[PDB]
Paper text:
Immature retroviruses are built by the [name] polyprotein; [name] is then cut into domains, and the resulting CA capsid proteins form the mature capsid, which can mediate infection of a new cell. [name] ([name]), the prototypic member of the γ-retroviruses, is commonly used in comparative studies and as a basis for retroviral vector design. The CA domain and immediate downstream residues mediate protein interactions in the immature shell, and, following proteolytic cleavage, CA forms the mature viral capsid. In this study, we have determined the structure of the truncated [name] CA-CTD by X-ray crystallography and have resolved the architecture and CA lattice structures of immature and mature [name] particles by cryo-ET and subtomogram averaging.
We identified 1,299 pentamerically coordinated positions from the 134 virions in our dataset, extracted subtomograms at these positions, and iteratively aligned and averaged them to generate a structure of the mature [name] CA pentamer at a resolution of 8.6 Å. CA domains were fitted into the map as rigid bodies. Comparison of the interfaces between neighboring CA molecules in the pentamer and hexamer revealed subtle differences in these interactions but no dramatic opening of the interdomain cleft as we previously observed in the HIV-1 pentamer. The mature [name] cores consisted of flat areas of lattice joined at seams with locally higher curvature, and with pentamers positioned at the highly curved vertices. Within spiral or nested cores, more than 12 pentamers are required to accommodate the increased total curvature, and we observed as many as 24 pentamers within a single virus particle. As the total curvature of a multilayered structure is greater than that in a sphere, more than 12 pentamers are present in [name] particles. The presence of pentamers, rather than gaps as in the immature lattice, suggests that having a CA lattice without holes may be important during early stages of the [name] lifecycle.
Numbering used by the authors:
A (entry chain D), C (entry chain B): 1 to 236
B (entry chain C), D (entry chain A): 159 to 236
E (entry chain A): 80 to 158
Write the structure that this text describes.
């Protein structure tokens, strides 16, 4: 880690192994749920200002050999030339994201800039490495749970679009597509009512969530239902 | 036809293409849908592309006669 | 450990025993899997900038008596004379990798250079000691498991090359060699398809892994298979 | 050779190519013939093309040893 | 190749270098000899390029030393 010392100069100290192992032990593996470790590492990359060696310890400790490899190749694939476009030119790729220890000196603006870029690319690598290619079945498999709010369900549905399709669920051109999955895969009472909405074509995704909440928010409390039953007085 | 009759969305609109495409993939016959889902650069496939890819699988129907012949020539007993 | 202080001067502090014991407890023994501790120590040698005494604590804590001995003799065998060749001259060996506390002063360029070299040789020692006499049968014995991903299998295969051969599986000159083992020892369905690839000679190790993943990723779910069987409707 | 010996047609004549091609497809081994028949743009295939396509199938012979190994690893009992 | 060292599909050039019908090349003349040299060179090139034998790694893995087979004989079959 690096921090600005009291004398206006960067100061280095190695990661405590307790931090590294705590981060590992309090999160799922990268493969299980890439978002967890990616968010943790994104944070640490900022607060701990790791050097290249520090990043090797992070990756080496939190990822398996196969995960780290995926991340490193993904990071190198994220390198851009001075024209802002991808580049596979060995010298450019190596200069941005070196696989072997670089001579970056954190006391120099040159060293610092490389470190900044390295960390940015590392993050990109992790973000991209966490992609279950395309698998539409995963999107169709997101079904609202019986206690799950419509907004929570929609967020899980969008997460599946992100992970398992090439479509961005936040794109304006995807709205009807996400809307149809939302209606079809909502809890059955909700989906049947959303399907019956007047001027359904006119409903935004936000509108549909609000309409589903009205039904959900009409959950008819268990206690209430039980009370009704008791006061049923209809015998057989 | 179902989009036309039972939704306000025109399935021929350019803005509906991904929507119709997703229904097409999801509701195709299971062998076809599983293969369309696995297409490389799926995001880049038009509705016309998806139909052509599905036809390749369908057109690989593996004739009933052919299948039966294979079974006969199976020679694997139990 | 040493770090550059806020005053531009190296600053020393002893290892926290919690770090040493955490490193030990979160890894296999050196004998079980030398790569684990070797990678951890390689990292620490950089981030913690250990002195000679610090290195003795590292080794003393993470390795058994027999492992440490192997490593130390391997490190001394890695010493090079000024002509870049191996040397068994006692004075040269002792000067580079002393078995007893040296008078190295980290506040001097002389002391620092010796420390750098010492750490480099220590790493070399570990890398070579983790070199279980050459045993090609161990490499041929790495076979992809029925649930094992191609990338996970390749990492195990590379680990066997490292431990049981003198060949570095990451060398460009070893690529076809590792590729052939990868094809031959992949799961049978995968190996048969990789063998049939068009322009096979042109496939990199990375290409082969991606092609194997396409087959693996076509795993044909157990549920799916069962469903197919049920819908079989072919009786006897 | 059979065309030469037992017909008046020269199998190397450009005007005989489709004729020889059809015999080649029809009289190839059954697995090969069925696949050649299914080739896309079959009309466009020369005799040389057809031979190369048949070689791809033949060259996919699925070694006896390989087949046996598969069977052994079958683990499906009856 | 044409005189500019590049490929050519010009019938007259192709025919002149590698004729499909008997040419009038006279081996007692430097002209005839040079054409013969070129013809042979092109014939070799043709064979080299027509080659391109389909790959099949299973065939290489299938070469196993026989119980009576000497190591050098086995190595030659493997090669």
């Amino acid at each position: 880690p690096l921090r600005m010392g009291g004398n206006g100069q960067l100061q280095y100290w190695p990661f405590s192994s307790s931090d590294l192992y705590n981060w590992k032990n309090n999160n799922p593996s990268f493969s299980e749920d890439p978002g967890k470790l990616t968010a943790l590492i994104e944070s640490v990359l900022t607060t701990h200002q790791p050097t290249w060696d520090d990043c090797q310890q992070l990756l080496g400790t939190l990822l398996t050999g196969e995960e780290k490899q995926r991340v490193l190749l993904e990071a190198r694939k994220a390198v851009r030339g001075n024209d802002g476009r991808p580049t596979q030119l060995p010298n450019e790729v190596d200069a941005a994201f070196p696989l072997e220890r670089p001579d970056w000196d954190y006391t120099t603006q040159r060293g610092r800039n490389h470190l900044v870029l390295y960390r940015q690319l590392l993050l990109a690598g992790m973000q991209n490495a966490g992609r279950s290619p395309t698998n539409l079945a995963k999107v169709k498999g997101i079904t609202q749970g019986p206690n799950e709010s419509p907004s929570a369900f929609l967020e899980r549905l969008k997460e599946a679009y992100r992970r398992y399709t090439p479509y961005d669920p936040e794109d304006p051109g995807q709205e009807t597509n996400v809307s149809m999955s939302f209606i079809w895969q909502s809890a059955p009472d909700i989906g049947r009512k959303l399907e019956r909405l007047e001027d359904l074509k006119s409903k935004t995704l936000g509108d549909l969530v609000r309409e589903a909440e009205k039904i959900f928010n009409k959950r008819e409390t268990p206690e209430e239902r039980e009370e009704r039953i008791r006061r049923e007085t209809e015998e057989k």
